[PDB]
Scaffold this active site. Structure first.
Site, PDB file in Angstrom:
ATOM      1  N   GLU A 101     -96.083  36.098-115.272  1.00  0.00           N
ATOM      2  CA  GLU A 101     -96.545  36.063-113.877  1.00  0.00           C
ATOM      3  C   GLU A 101     -97.809  36.915-113.758  1.00  0.00           C
ATOM      4  OE1 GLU A 101     -96.920  38.514-111.486  1.00  0.00           O
ATOM      5  OE2 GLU A 101     -97.091  37.333-109.609  1.00  0.00           O
TER       6      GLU A 101
ATOM      7  N   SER B 164    -115.503  15.956 -82.989  1.00  0.00           N
ATOM      8  CA  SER B 164    -114.300  15.992 -82.144  1.00  0.00           C
ATOM      9  C   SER B 164    -113.044  16.300 -82.903  1.00  0.00           C
ATOM     10  CB  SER B 164    -114.097  14.654 -81.428  1.00  0.00           C
ATOM     11  OG  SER B 164    -112.960  14.721 -80.580  1.00  0.00           O
TER      12      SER B 164
ATOM     13  N   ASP C 168     -82.895  13.197 -97.251  1.00  0.00           N
ATOM     14  CA  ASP C 168     -84.203  12.832 -97.917  1.00  0.00           C
ATOM     15  C   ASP C 168     -85.385  12.933 -96.990  1.00  0.00           C
ATOM     16  OD1 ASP C 168     -82.722  12.379-100.322  1.00  0.00           O
ATOM     17  OD2 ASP C 168     -83.074  10.219-100.317  1.00  0.00           O
TER      18      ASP C 168
ATOM     19  N   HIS D  12    -101.672  20.938-100.748  1.00  0.00           N
ATOM     20  CA  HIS D  12    -101.081  21.003 -99.401  1.00  0.00           C
ATOM     21  C   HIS D  12    -102.218  21.084 -98.395  1.00  0.00           C
ATOM     22  CE1 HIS D  12     -98.237  22.201 -96.256  1.00  0.00           C
ATOM     23  NE2 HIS D  12     -97.260  22.153 -97.121  1.00  0.00           N
TER      24      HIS D  12
HETATM   25 ZN   LIG Z   1     -94.700  40.773-109.663  1.00  0.00          ZN
HETATM   26 ZN   LIG Z   2     -97.496  42.377-110.230  1.00  0.00          ZN
END
Ligand SMILES: [Zn+2]
Ligand SMILES: [Zn+2]
Ligand SMILES: *[C@@H]1O[C@H](CO)[C@@H](O[C@@H]2O[C@H](CO)[C@@H](O[C@@H]3O[C@H](CO[C@H]4O[C@H](CO)[C@@H](O)[C@H](O)[C@@H]4O)[C@@H](O)[C@H](O[C@H]4O[C@H](CO)[C@@H](O)[C@H](O)[C@@H]4O)[C@@H]3O)[C@H](O)[C@H]2NC(C)=O)[C@H](O)[C@H]1NC(C)=O
Ligand SMILES: *[C@@H]1O[C@H](CO)[C@@H](O[C@@H]2O[C@H](CO)[C@@H](O[C@@H]3O[C@H](CO[C@H]4O[C@H](CO)[C@@H](O)[C@H](O)[C@@H]4O)[C@@H](O)[C@H](O[C@H]4O[C@H](CO)[C@@H](O)[C@H](O)[C@@H]4O)[C@@H]3O)[C@H](O)[C@H]2NC(C)=O)[C@H](O)[C@H]1NC(C)=O
Ligand SMILES: *[C@@H]1O[C@H](CO)[C@@H](O[C@@H]2O[C@H](CO)[C@@H](O[C@@H]3O[C@H](CO)[C@@H](O)[C@H](O)[C@@H]3O)[C@H](O)[C@H]2NC(C)=O)[C@H](O)[C@H]1NC(C)=O
Ligand SMILES: *[C@@H]1O[C@H](CO)[C@@H](O[C@@H]2O[C@H](CO)[C@@H](O[C@@H]3O[C@H](CO)[C@@H](O)[C@H](O)[C@@H]3O)[C@H](O)[C@H]2NC(C)=O)[C@H](O)[C@H]1NC(C)=O
Ligand SMILES: *[C@@H]1O[C@H](CO)[C@@H](O[C@@H]2O[C@H](CO)[C@@H](O)[C@H](O)[C@H]2NC(C)=O)[C@H](O)[C@H]1NC(C)=O
Ligand SMILES: *[C@@H]1O[C@H](CO)[C@@H](O[C@@H]2O[C@H](CO)[C@@H](O)[C@H](O)[C@H]2NC(C)=O)[C@H](O)[C@H]1NC(C)=O
Ligand SMILES: *[C@@H]1O[C@H](CO)[C@@H](O[C@@H]2O[C@H](CO)[C@@H](O)[C@H](O)[C@H]2NC(C)=O)[C@H](O)[C@H]1NC(C)=O
Ligand SMILES: *[C@@H]1O[C@H](CO)[C@@H](O[C@@H]2O[C@H](CO)[C@@H](O)[C@H](O)[C@H]2NC(C)=O)[C@H](O)[C@H]1NC(C)=O
Ligand SMILES: *[C@@H]1O[C@H](CO)[C@@H](O[C@@H]2O[C@H](CO)[C@@H](O)[C@H](O)[C@H]2NC(C)=O)[C@H](O)[C@H]1NC(C)=O
Ligand SMILES: *[C@@H]1O[C@H](CO)[C@@H](O[C@@H]2O[C@H](CO)[C@@H](O)[C@H](O)[C@H]2NC(C)=O)[C@H](O)[C@H]1NC(C)=O
Ligand SMILES: *[C@@H]1O[C@H](CO)[C@@H](O)[C@H](O)[C@H]1NC(C)=O
Ligand SMILES: *[C@@H]1O[C@H](CO)[C@@H](O)[C@H](O)[C@H]1NC(C)=O
Ligand SMILES: *[C@@H]1O[C@H](CO)[C@@H](O)[C@H](O)[C@H]1NC(C)=O
Ligand SMILES: *[C@@H]1O[C@H](CO)[C@@H](O)[C@H](O)[C@H]1NC(C)=O
Ligand SMILES: [Ca+2]
Ligand SMILES: [Ca+2]
Ligand SMILES: [Cl-]
Ligand SMILES: [Cl-]
Ligand SMILES: [Zn+2]
Ligand SMILES: [Zn+2]
Lengths: 695, 695
Positions: A370, A574, A611, A634
């Site tokens: 991460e 617009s 769903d 998104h």
């Molecule tokens: Zn973290």
């Molecule tokens: Zn971190």
């Protein structure tokens, strides 16, 4: 009974404490042996706790590490070329850890190598507006300069991108006490403040959702074809290094040139905060020199994936995920979260052993890498994207459980607002002075929403964590929750010991949460959300809550445009189509809600309607992505182009409007604003139509 | 009973004949009033036939029309500038239609305007290999020349793209009798051949799946933002016009320069087929001049959408679609198909009135502007993409029902092979000499597959019709079926009267299908497929049939690569990952098939397994698309980059390998081959994994 109360009551603060201690005695840096060992431990325990399967999913991704025999540092260098001052080679280790091996020294992950030498320019927080002030108002040119910036306000990757575009040849990042030393609190080990030798690690990529820099779009498996470094995604082109405030004081104290333009540019060190370029009179021929020797290297990472198969809808996935890799000990980030996930798994597995199964399948994840760019979560989602697209109900993140001790923080999709309000009304507050009251009550009192009164603040999802692939790429309803500090006093710096060696088990046990009660409350919120998502017969999403916020976001973006009334007249700009779509979504969502209450309580009508609820977040995805950011798909929410941590609403229109009065071809610029209005109105209407009767 | 036999027996050849006559008395050109009137008629009749709802879906798209007061034509022009020969302004109208108004004259839709004058080069069929021969072997340079090409072999858009890249400043297309005059058959009206004054209309775009040139990605609704013409998708940059063989004879008869390189370059006219450039001796100072004045104009189009709501799974769509717009009368293209759809709707509505409903929802479509680039189908799919992605079971196309009278033609996904074999075994052959035998039996005998013996030929889907958005963009299982001519004699020209004024009701009634029995057989095949798709409790797809063809395609692409054994050694090019993935898909599909037979005959297990079948075609979609063709997203099948009508398997690898021995940087070229191998192996494995147990 096997119900939510049974699940919740089984959760123990003492277990969370034991797991936290267990996970924080040695570093677990991504790509290191120690973090592979911990993955194997978690895998074995989750099996023992009762999950149906627990596997490791591995990838070979681009990571970054300093050179152990050739240390990174910064100097002040004189006319002869002697280094008269050097920054530190490491953070002084905390008490009792001074013999721990393999503490990675402070560095900026993914920095290229180099030894640039030059004059300093101080650029405040290196925000877009900081560079505007420098270039446009003060006429200071950063080209060929080394810039020095304070951490804070925005993601450090955005700082480095902004410096590069200003022409810098290097970046020095430092922690100012203004941002990382709270008044009246002592430095670690005697309190939770940042000492002057402390330094914040972190990556400086601009991945815009790509994951592994070398394999955008596809999992970094054994046969993957990898981009060459020069074609890699998101790498910085100039060297970068972080330092603490004792060292920063020595680099700043001699600065000359222009004064700071106003007081929002001055931190708390006893220096003038001059912008430069260069040093004052006597020292004008002195220079700053960086020495960066880190290397980028493809390295194996390991995610742990646990499955608790659903009894009724096994092909519907509710995911609880958070990361396991840490910069050093990870006392807060991530192990305060990982310990909470561990105890949640244990409680669900207790029920399972007594014969219970949830309605839907629950997946549990311990993500790797991460800290190096959401790499582990993103590679796994890339691999499994088809399963996730068609079967993903919800993703609940589980990084740090605490960043303060004041109140609850929740950031989530509007689809989960009702679920969160309802669950928190049923949980006990851990807060002093709210004994016997609900969590909803304390939360709402300490963190009033800036909209509704009698309601609590719930923020938009931004990014800088492992939900990004799930939410902004794939369109799976996502949320996160933790304990946090007072919003009134929140300077958007993060907690002082963030990504420092001082973030230890002791920090948490002594200063944040001695009784582990805030941890337990966050386990109840995260685990309770998972429980309801995975077991409620009707999914616990309220589409009407999306309608309400879409109107707010449309008002907001219209208000931004209306700063330019002449251009909106000239180019016939617009927002009527957007407002129309939002009105239709509001109407259609209201009728769908009626049917969901009135329908014949028929499993196909039930699976149809579930769903429609599941695919409603999905409907906000545009397969073409946003401009020059293909993995932010998104339409309603993207990470801010100026700050990855912050969410932006109607991002395509926002970025089309941003600084538009400076574009050289206004016809073209306002054309693109109109284009983005069309895309947004269309996507809102299309999402609405997924909630109409199906035939 | 209300079963498939009831449905099939209600279908009448005489009804198909009546509808065909009704649809073919006046032109129904896209964007014209007459075609709006016909849309309204179809809408009203489908309501009367019993559908639950029937609506018009309209869009404003870029269309192209000649200028009525400024006609298009080509000349031979002498030294003084006098036009000594002019091509025709219109096709002589057939008997009895010589007073019909609004017959559009022959033109190439989307040609830019211009009056280029120059020397001719004859380029055979203007195929990629034809230009290779000219440039590489014969050293003839087309730059600044007007090229003249015979229709045939490939889509005319590919011809024009190829001419443009060769440097042509114009293109003349003509119909050679070699390709459009069958031996021993008379010209219309006395037979089904192309007369010398006949001309084939058609568009010359290169849209690569985009739909309306001005709105790629989004429906061309009332608030759409449109690209400017210069940024539009797929428009040609040089003028283009089609002519018949009487006129072509006059342009070719004087050609000089080089001889044709071999006999595959010579058609059947009494001319030498010299390549040029220019005319022989006496005429060397004569030139060819085009006059093109057509205009592109945004114009409203109308699709008719009919719904027959499913009794059990209304949120599952089985779509029967084909177009309604015609170049002129559309006696074959499209009305032979539209009449078949009309009778299918009528038969389904007969059952509905007696209280029956299919299991799943059936959608019926009358698309507009197919002839201008699949515009109507593609805009509607753009609008409804989220519903289609998540609910689309299958698309069955319904353009021309006949292009010959010899045997059945089916092109479809492997997922429908079993369904087609089974249905055809239950239908009666209409073929002379197979009275009392099955359609399967006649089909297999007249059209043996080039793989399996005792099996019939089923082709890959290519493109050039309205299934493209559904199959190659969205990944919905698709198919088509019609009666066709003998494959042995098929020169890939199309039928002689294609897109000519001579394609009339009489052509069909007198020469193709007097008894309307081939039409009835095609109604049974199309309608039978829809019936089974919409009513079978388990979807009638066999994933094992995909496994078998994936192995064939992997063998094929490997064989292509293996023409370059030295480079495969130098650059370490292996297909092992692709073969592995295909092996895994084969294994996993076999186990899934076992479960589908053995499962507890549990509606959730049923809906789970039906979703796995429905999303299996979906799994072959790559959201990043193919290189420079974002709307061709299916990894296994794309339209050929050299011929839109033909399908290519593993297109990304195919195009990476194509002409690779001519690339200047082989390292880079073979790198991209490896990249495409990785993408393909990954997508095959990912698709396999959708058929594993879900948890
Ligand atoms: Zn973290
Ligand atoms: Zn971190
Ligand atoms: C919010 O939801 C509402 C529905 O409640 C949508 O309303 C639609 O709005 C569009 C755009 O305004 C309307 O479009 C107009 O359609 C007319 C024909 O409509 C009839 O016929 C169609 C079939 O083709 C039926 O489906 C429909 O129900 C009607 O029976 C056109 O004639 C109009 O074009 C004319 O006027 C315009 C504007 O001046 C000119 O530019 C044209 O040149 C032309 O002269 C127009 O296209 C549509 O009818 C409305 N639908 C319904 C069901 O009421 C909103 O669109 C929606 N918001 C968003 C953002 O989607
Ligand atoms: C077709 O389906 C088969 C499965 O039947 C797939 O087989 C996999 O193939 C990959 C690639 O060969 C194997 O990858 C190897 O995994 C080893 C570890 O695997 C164990 O641990 C993992 C958890 O991390 C478990 O999931 C797994 O079941 C095993 O318990 C690695 O150690 C290997 O790396 C080492 O060797 C390679 C090759 O020399 C070196 O490059 C590395 O540096 C390292 O030394 C390797 O990564 C995988 O184990 C196989 N899986 C299974 C379940 O058998 C095929 O991949 C699939 N085809 C396609 C195209 O997907
Ligand atoms: C959060 O909790 C609220 C309050 O309990 C839940 O809202 C309530 O939901 C119930 C169950 O559907 C609603 O009951 C229904 O009332 C209608 C009204 O006529 C009736 O016809 C139905 O048969 C049923 O009895 C109830 O009205 C509703 N209350 C309110 C104030 O909205 C809500 O659904 C919970 N949210 C989530 C995501 O679970
Ligand atoms: C096309 O028709 C063929 C031949 O009828 C269908 O294949 C047959 O499908 C049936 C029904 O599932 C199979 O019956 C099953 O047999 C297994 C075998 O042990 C048994 O355990 C099951 O309970 C069931 O009786 C049958 O075996 C099978 N025959 C063959 C040769 O495959 C086929 O499914 C049809 N295709 C489509 C798309 O409908
Ligand atoms: C963290 O806890 C784990 C699990 O209790 C400990 O790992 C176990 O250690 C014992 C004693 O060495 C072994 O017998 C087990 O095989 C280990 N189990 C597993 C699943 O790995 C680990 O020692 C603890 N770490 C720390 C620092 O306390
Ligand atoms: C900062 O560190 C540098 C590099 O280690 C020191 O400079 C070196 O000093 C040694 C020993 O005197 C010389 O042999 C090297 O040639 C020098 N290297 C370089 C690159 O200059 C420097 O003394 C240190 N400065 C301070 C103030 O401690
Ligand atoms: C834990 O909570 C305590 C009590 O709120 C915090 O201490 C207070 O901090 C605020 C400043 O924000 C002061 O107004 C109070 O005077 C402080 N009281 C005491 C007893 O110290 C403490 O800051 C919290 N710990 C962490 C890590 O945030
Ligand atoms: C095609 O068939 C349609 C339907 O039978 C005919 O249109 C009908 O014409 C009658 C007589 O003019 C009218 O009373 C009806 O209102 C029409 N119905 C509909 C639904 O439009 C049409 O005339 C036929 N066209 C041709 C050329 O034969
Ligand atoms: C081909 O058509 C052209 C254009 O109509 C004819 O040329 C024109 O002839 C008229 C009447 O003689 C002149 O007034 C125009 O100036 C000419 N226009 C052009 C553009 O040349 C030409 O005669 C026709 N050629 C043949 C053989 O019929
Ligand atoms: C309809 O079918 C007839 C019979 O097959 C076709 O006529 C034959 O065509 C082939 C050439 O392909 C010859 O070998 C036969 O000698 C022809 N026989 C007769 C009686 O004409 C006819 O071509 C078909 N019609 C269409 C439009 O394809
Ligand atoms: C690290 O630096 C040393 C010596 O200073 C050098 O020889 C070595 O190659 C470097 N290692 C890496 C991985 O770059
Ligand atoms: C900034 O400085 C560099 C350094 O030479 C120069 O090339 C660039 O044009 C300067 N820009 C401005 C606005 O002065
Ligand atoms: C068609 O040509 C005429 C006269 O030859 C011209 O005046 C008119 O503008 C053209 N029409 C269009 C639509 O281009
Ligand atoms: C083809 O002809 C054009 C015409 O001037 C020229 O510019 C181009 O380079 C030529 N190419 C070759 C290969 O002769
Ligand atoms: Ca990747
Ligand atoms: Ca479009
Ligand atoms: Cl979190
Ligand atoms: Cl067809
Ligand atoms: Zn057609
Ligand atoms: Zn056609």
């Amino acid at each position: 009974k096997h119900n939510m109360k049974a699940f919740l009551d089984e959760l123990k603060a003492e277990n969370i404490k034991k797991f936290l201690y267990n996970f924080t005695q040695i570093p677990h840096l991504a790509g290191t042996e120690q973090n592979f060992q911990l993955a194997k431990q978690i895998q074995s325990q989750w099996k023992e706790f009762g999950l149906d399967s627990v596997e490791l999913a591995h990838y070979d991704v681009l990571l970054s590490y300093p050179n152990k025999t050739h240390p990174n540092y910064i100097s002040i260098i004189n006319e002869d070329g002697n280094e008269i001052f050097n920054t530190s080679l490491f953070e002084p280790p905390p008490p009792g850890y001074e013999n721990v091996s393999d503490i990675v020294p402070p560095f900026s992950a993914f920095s290229p190598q180099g030894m640039p030498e030059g004059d300093l320019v101080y650029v405040n927080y290196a925000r877009t507006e900081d560079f505007f002030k420098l270039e446009r108002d003060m006429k200071i040119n950063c080209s060929g300069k080394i810039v020095i910036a304070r951490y804070g306000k925005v993601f450090r990757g955005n700082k480095v991108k902004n410096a590069q575009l200003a022409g810098a040849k290097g970046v020095i990042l430092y922690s100012d006490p203004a941002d990382y030393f709270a008044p009246g609190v002592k430095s670690y080990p005697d309190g939770w403040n940042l000492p002057g030798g402390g330094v914040q690690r972190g990556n400086i990529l601009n991945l815009n959702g790509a994951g592994d820099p070398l394999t955008p779009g596809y999992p970094a498996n054994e046969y993957a074809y990898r981009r060459g470094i020069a074609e890699a995604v998101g790498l910085p082109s100039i060297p970068v290094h972080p330092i603490g405030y004792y060292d920063a004081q020595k680099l700043l104290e001699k600065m000359g040139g222009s004064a700071p333009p106003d007081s929002s540019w001055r931190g708390s060190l006893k220096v003038p905060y001059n912008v430069g370029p260069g040093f004052t009179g006597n020292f004008s021929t002195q220079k700053v020199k960086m020495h960066i020797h880190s290397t980028n290297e493809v390295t194996r990472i390991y995610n742990v994936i646990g499955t608790l198969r659903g009894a009724v809808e096994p092909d519907r996935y509710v995911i609880l995920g958070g990361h396991r890799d840490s910069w050093v000990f990870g006392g807060i980030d991530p192990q305060s979260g990982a310990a909470v996930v561990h105890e949640i798994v244990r409680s669900f597995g207790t029920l399972k052993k007594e014969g219970w199964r949830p309605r839907r399948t629950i997946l549990f994840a311990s993500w790797d890498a991460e800290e190096f760019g959401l790499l582990g979560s993103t590679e796994w989602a890339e691999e499994n994207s088809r399963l996730l697209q068609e079967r993903g109900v919800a993703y609940i993140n589980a990084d740090s459980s605490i960043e303060g001790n004041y109140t609850l923080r929740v950031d989530c999709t509007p689809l989960m607002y009702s679920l969160v309000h309802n669950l928190t009304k049923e949980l006990k507050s851990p807060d002093e002075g709210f004994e016997g009251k609900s969590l909803y009550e304390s939360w709402t009192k300490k963190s009033p929403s800036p909209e509704f009164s009698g309601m609590p603040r719930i923020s938009k999802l931004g990014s800088g964590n492992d939900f990004e692939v799930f939410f902004q790429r794939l369109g799976i309803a996502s949320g996160r929750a933790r304990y946090t500090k007072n919003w009134e006093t929140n300077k958007f710096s993060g907690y002082p010991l963030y990504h420092s060696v001082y973030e230890t088990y002791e920090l948490v046990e002594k200063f944040y949460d001695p009784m582990f009660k805030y941890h337990l409350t966050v386990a109840q919120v995260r685990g309770g959300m998972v429980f309801e998502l995975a077991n409620s017969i009707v999914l616990p999403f309220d589409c009407r809550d999306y309608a309400v916020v879409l109107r707010k976001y449309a008002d907001k973006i219209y208000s931004i445009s209306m700063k330019h009334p002449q251009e909106m007249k000239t180019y016939s700009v617009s927002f009527d189509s957007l407002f129309s779509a939002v009105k239709n979504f509001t109407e259609i969502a209201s009728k769908f809600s009626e049917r969901l209450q009135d329908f014949d309580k028929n499993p196909i009508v039930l699976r149809m309607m579930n769903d429609q609820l599941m695919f409603l977040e999905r409907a906000f995805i545009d397969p073409l992505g946003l401009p020059d950011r293909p993995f932010y798909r998104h339409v309603i929410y993207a990470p801010s182009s100026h700050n990855k941590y912050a969410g932006e609403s109607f991002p395509g229109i926002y970025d089309a409007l941003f600084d538009i009065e400076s574009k050289v071809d206004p016809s073209k610029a306002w054309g693109e604003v109109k284009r983005q209005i069309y895309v947004a109105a269309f996507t809102v209407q299309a999402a609405a139509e997924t909630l109409s009767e199906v035939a």
